[PDB]
Design a protein around this ligand. Sequence first.
Ligand SMILES: NC(=O)NCc1ccco1
Ligand SMILES: NC(=O)NCc1ccco1
Ligand SMILES: NC(=O)NCc1ccco1
Ligand SMILES: NC(=O)NCc1ccco1
Ligand SMILES: NC(=O)NCc1ccco1
Lengths: 348, 348, 348, 348, 348
Amino acid sequence: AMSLENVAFNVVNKGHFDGQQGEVPVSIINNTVYTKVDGVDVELFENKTTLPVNVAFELWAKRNIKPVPEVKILNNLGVDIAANTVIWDYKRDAPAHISTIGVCSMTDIAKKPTETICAPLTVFFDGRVDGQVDLFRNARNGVLITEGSVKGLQPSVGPKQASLNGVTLIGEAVKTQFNYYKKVDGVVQQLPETYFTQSRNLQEFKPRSQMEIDFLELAMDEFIERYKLEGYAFEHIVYGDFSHSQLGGLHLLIGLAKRFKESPFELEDFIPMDSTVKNYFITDAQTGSSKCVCSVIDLLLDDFVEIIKSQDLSVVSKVVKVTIDYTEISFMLWCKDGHVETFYPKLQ
Amino acid sequence: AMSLENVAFNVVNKGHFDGQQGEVPVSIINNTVYTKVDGVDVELFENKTTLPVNVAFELWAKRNIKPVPEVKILNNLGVDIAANTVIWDYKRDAPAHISTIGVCSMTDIAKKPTETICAPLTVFFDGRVDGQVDLFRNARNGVLITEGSVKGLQPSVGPKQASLNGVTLIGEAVKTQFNYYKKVDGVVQQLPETYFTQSRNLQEFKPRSQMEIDFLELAMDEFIERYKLEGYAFEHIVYGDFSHSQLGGLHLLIGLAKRFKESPFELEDFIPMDSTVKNYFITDAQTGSSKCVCSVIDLLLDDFVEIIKSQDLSVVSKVVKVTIDYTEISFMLWCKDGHVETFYPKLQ
Amino acid sequence: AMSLENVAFNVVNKGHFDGQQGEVPVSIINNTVYTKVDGVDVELFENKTTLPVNVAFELWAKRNIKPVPEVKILNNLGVDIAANTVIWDYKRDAPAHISTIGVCSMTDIAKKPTETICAPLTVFFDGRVDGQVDLFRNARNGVLITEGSVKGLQPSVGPKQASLNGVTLIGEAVKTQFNYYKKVDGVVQQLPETYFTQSRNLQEFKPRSQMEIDFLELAMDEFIERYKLEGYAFEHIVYGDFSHSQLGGLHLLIGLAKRFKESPFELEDFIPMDSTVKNYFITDAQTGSSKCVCSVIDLLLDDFVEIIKSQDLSVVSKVVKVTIDYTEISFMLWCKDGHVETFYPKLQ
Amino acid sequence: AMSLENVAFNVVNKGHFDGQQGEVPVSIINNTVYTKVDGVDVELFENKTTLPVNVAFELWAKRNIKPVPEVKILNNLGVDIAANTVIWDYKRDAPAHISTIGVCSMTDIAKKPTETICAPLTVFFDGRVDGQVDLFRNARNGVLITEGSVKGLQPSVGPKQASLNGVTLIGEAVKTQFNYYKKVDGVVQQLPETYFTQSRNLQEFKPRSQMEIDFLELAMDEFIERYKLEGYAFEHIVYGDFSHSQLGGLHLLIGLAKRFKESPFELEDFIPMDSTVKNYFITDAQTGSSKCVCSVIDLLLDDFVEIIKSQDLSVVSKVVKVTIDYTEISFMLWCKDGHVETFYPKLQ
Amino acid sequence: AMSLENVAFNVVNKGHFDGQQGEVPVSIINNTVYTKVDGVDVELFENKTTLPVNVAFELWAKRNIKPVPEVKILNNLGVDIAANTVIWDYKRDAPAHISTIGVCSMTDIAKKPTETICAPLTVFFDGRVDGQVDLFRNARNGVLITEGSVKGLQPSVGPKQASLNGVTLIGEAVKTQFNYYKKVDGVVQQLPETYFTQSRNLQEFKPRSQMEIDFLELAMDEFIERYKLEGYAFEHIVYGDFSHSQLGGLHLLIGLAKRFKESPFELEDFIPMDSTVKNYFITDAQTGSSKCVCSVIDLLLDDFVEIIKSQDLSVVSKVVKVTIDYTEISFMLWCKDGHVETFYPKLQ
Ligand SMILES: NC(=O)NCc1ccco1
Ligand SMILES: NC(=O)NCc1ccco1
Ligand SMILES: NC(=O)NCc1ccco1
Ligand SMILES: NC(=O)NCc1ccco1
Ligand SMILES: NC(=O)NCc1ccco1
């Protein structure tokens, strides 16, 4: 007995949609949902989506409140739709997927993922929900996450972190590391060997290794000395060059975090969404050095160091494909006289 | 079990809210309510009110579909709120009253009119609904309509016409003439002697008397000759003078209807609402004669002749108070040498 | 003492802005202005402009309520702004000009047209307002309209019709024929010889000559016989050809009006504005003959016969420039063997 | 002479409405008020209310800029409307009350609180404004605040803090502690003996006692040791349990503030308004422990300690009613073997 | 080949408009521009302007990404429009100017600044763009900025800081100090001798002199002692008096920054725009001292000290005009017995 008033009742009483019965009076004004709390209207939801306000309200209330894969992972895996849940994209304030399966009558393409409409779409299955491993086995296309072993299915250990209600974290009270499985045209596809982005912030960047502790504490020339990084252009790539009008390098989040403690800078996120590689229009406030498209990736410094050190430095310029977050990230390697000039996530 | 989806279900299946169970999928976009009909959205309601779109949708769906008093009558009687119904104002595309009683949880001030909040307000009671005559008897303030006699209560025979779903008509299959009763502070009132406006349209004006048939068929000087209207300025007041830049007179709907058959004109209804007297910015398309505020009243021509004939034509200018539709309508009488110069609903 | 509440007071009490003092309570919701009339909101204005709702409300309330030149005439004369008035464009539900002079503080570029900002702009002056003939004499650029003679200034007799509150009419109670004067860079211009469009409607088309009476009453081959129009393609140009999938000709409003009495058709006005030549996507409902861009001009049939009769019918195709409404209208003349094939307002 | 342009003039020149004369040109676009400052529009107000944009602009400009009671206090006291002022709810970006008394013609139910419409409503009176103590004496329903003694009226000393322009503070340059008085149906009602919430923030939480200094500085088991809090479940209730998927306890703001220094967490305020007890959907970022409805109250730790220590621990579960902010806050006490299991503001 | 889809392509691929060819599918919803990134909409721009959403999107994408003069400087110089660029006002989230020159067809008054429409307007020229010095020489009105010498043109050294993408900074990798030139009616106007505001923030205020280091570190009476500021009311003017209900003085940003470290306060920026002198409704959170209009100027403390020390203290009250940011800032000097009582940017 689905209704706007019942969704609002659940938001008010349960903090989210929890299948409870009841209704609260709602008023909809423009793109905002309100509820009368003792005579005055209290805002429950502000629609930031391209969907109708009441439709987005229900989808947001029916969002998965369990730790789920980050949208970038789901996207790199080709996920089109989720099975009997809504993955909320907190970075875009919108549902990660256009349609639903057994969630909301306005966005539903099917009630069960076994319906023919779902066969050509890569449905996301959560092995933590009863019957979803079997639904994945019978689904023509899908992505499955589990907490343990699935008999006969070869696992792909995913990232340590998951998104819980918009918070990217490595779980201690909850499991955030999942086993990943994919199916393309009824066939279980072998997921590639891959690195994972660390999903850290600039404001609260914490080192996750001794090399990262040394990078943040030590001076530039003495960190490079310790880790044998001479001839690998870390001064340009990771530390960044703020001497000319165009900002040089600065493509690893760890290098932005180090700069951040000394002096502030503006990162204009002109395509605000979750992605393995992010693009920013960066303006350094101390020097005035700036760059319209500064591609930034949050790799564990040891992982980036391993990627660059295992590259041949004999060619002037080549494309270096690295599998990060299950996707092939093309990088652009530029060399001269046996030393790296620059190495950056390739702008397409 | 009130819900947006259930109201929409009733609109879709029953043409209005009919207490039926069921839900249809709704999407709200801006000020418009839509329903999915086999994949595509179909518009159900366009909010023209100052209330939230979903709230106005429910009030409109819960409108009285029986012949009810015209909003102008209810307004002249001081009606603030209706009992367990919504009087839809089709001229304003909005509810006639701000609040409701046992209709919609967002607009309800009470569920039953017997609650203390309703005592100071003039509640509208419909004797055609079971128990409303008694509720009126125990209500401090109220206006009652009945089809027949109420024991002990002296009636006021209201207008012949009522509004059925926005159509003002004199019923043949339905009763449209009601008995009116009013109570102020527990005291049953003696409703004054009143004339009634005929609520006719310009496009479909029909004469309701022999004098009105003669006015529409006969020429100006020969109608006035027949009805001894010499010296009462009907040439100015009713027929209208289109010879000067400012349109002279034309204050009776019958005179606008007669002009309408010969040549067209524009009536700009700058305050669109139901009222005993209406104001228009009239532009005559044939001559170009115009007037910013031309007050127009639809009185039965015999009634308007009785009012003008029962006046003292000896003062230059005076205010002539006439009870029309239960309200006191001030008119402005202008005379010279014992003859009327002009007589029009007072602009104030 | 300009205010939203005062403008609304004038709209409510005077039918338009009339410099009266007073205020009424206003509420603005989306693009609509409302006023409280005894507890409920009554719509006063719906903004159809690209200006802010309160700004457009004031400009509309301050519109010229006297018969004024049609927007197409003002436009063909290069009028940029009006002096101390607002010419309301009733076809676009918007002000005819972007800025004002001494009208509204939000749109005003100057209070008086004598200010330097107005010198490069063609200010519209109305000789019917005290002091505007003199203001025109001292204005560098301007267009003047008068009812009678201006000493020393040679006049151009404008069209018979003017727009009074959105109604295009030939005045009987008011003067609608003006004398036109134009000045470019201080030099009084000699306005060219021009024809005028008749500004008629399809629903209420009235013949303004004996040739037009004969065209509407007589049959095709017998009207052409009477007026010696053999070889001038009137069967195609004026009457229209509805035998093929593409509608042939039908470029003169008189021919659309004649078709209209027999069978209906849809005219999609895809660029809704006032112009000498209008373009419509016409679909004939009887035959299904249609045309995406059917240019239509309302010329007096005698004027259109004079234009076609005074052409050289010896070249296959040429551009025929005709001055209509003071503007140069290009027509496309197509001939074969000394007879007209087609003649239509040039699509460019 | 109230107007949109005059309100805007006062906002621009006086920082708020100050009864000054003058007008500034305003443009209204969507839900935003703008003023032309040297040719370009500058935003003055963004409507976050369910009221029309110009109406909310005036109410916000006419907000009380003196230290006033917090909305939660006014709400717990049953305040419906304020007398000749607007209490701005800075937490909801909206007026605390639906209607006004002698403030704005669009929201006014009366000009003076002595009018009959105000008798059934609890009007808020400010003894700091001349004549408001007397108005309270003659008001059937009301809440009064004073800075000192009112002859014959028994006072209720309120909270130390008040809201000054959105800032909750304990005044030093201004008085923030008021005397409270209430009237229900013409009878002065004895306000209850009550505790008060401390109205602190998480970001800037400061201890207001030695017990609170000890709680924030000392370790868990050594604070409990010092204050004899063994067997009272402070480890669960105040400190919080982040070991399981559902976050245990954490119902006192002081415990959230202590957690905040060590590790961050997200508090989703799904009903954003001022209330004695607040509900949050909390997600701990370090552990991933979370709770959909975590009720949180900011009591002085000594006050909470006194509340819990004065409870009988013989029953498995009972409702414990505590008067906080003049309202009866129901708590749920759970015990086992003579020790407290949990104690939390009861979810209704 | 300008288009919405091409602007969006440039925003997506180049971080801003860069003249590149290509199109990305766009959807416009309300006041927001979106792009489909793998099936879901990603927000590219939120219109905060009074211009149409697609128009403001193009202007923002076409904003000057080089260090440009701060809007307050341009405004004090009388700049109306920029030549072949858009100066984005990041404080108002809108273009600094109403119209453009060769930027966007919807806002363009001309394609080149040499067109007659531009002659009466003060066009902004950037000597760093080829041909703009010459365009300034031929422009009737204009403001020019250069990086070096212009033959024959007497320079005015401007402020050290410029705005680069919204960031006010003193350039190290880029030049931010420009030479300024002005022309009024074809005549090069001598720019006045002036002080400059330091354009600092409260959150990140850094001293730019030894006097400013001493002010922030030293106590009140010992700073005044060192700098001989006795009898100059710095205790009131710069430090601020928080003892009475109305906040005393506090008109220099350095004094707000010093207060900020000790205790927080709210600055309501009721006219949010760039100006030499800013007005705030300040509420001190510790004391509750407040002021509706507290004018604040960010002058280098040495510059303010020099301004006040060079004033005659013989008159009770006088207007002190100081040229700051090329504009005459009127200050109000109040004296008694040879000592300063108060000195503040004069409220007009
Ligand atoms: N990342 C990873 O461990 N891939 C191995 C795999 C096995 C089956 C699917 O992927
Ligand atoms: N309020 C008032 O004056 N009412 C008049 C009345 C009371 C009873 C009958 O009429
Ligand atoms: N700008 C221009 O070329 N104007 C033509 C003109 C000037 C005077 C009379 O005509
Ligand atoms: N909180 C408190 O002090 N109550 C006592 C009281 C006296 C009159 C009304 O309340
Ligand atoms: N500020 C300044 O240096 N003014 C001198 C000047 C010379 C020409 C124009 O201004």
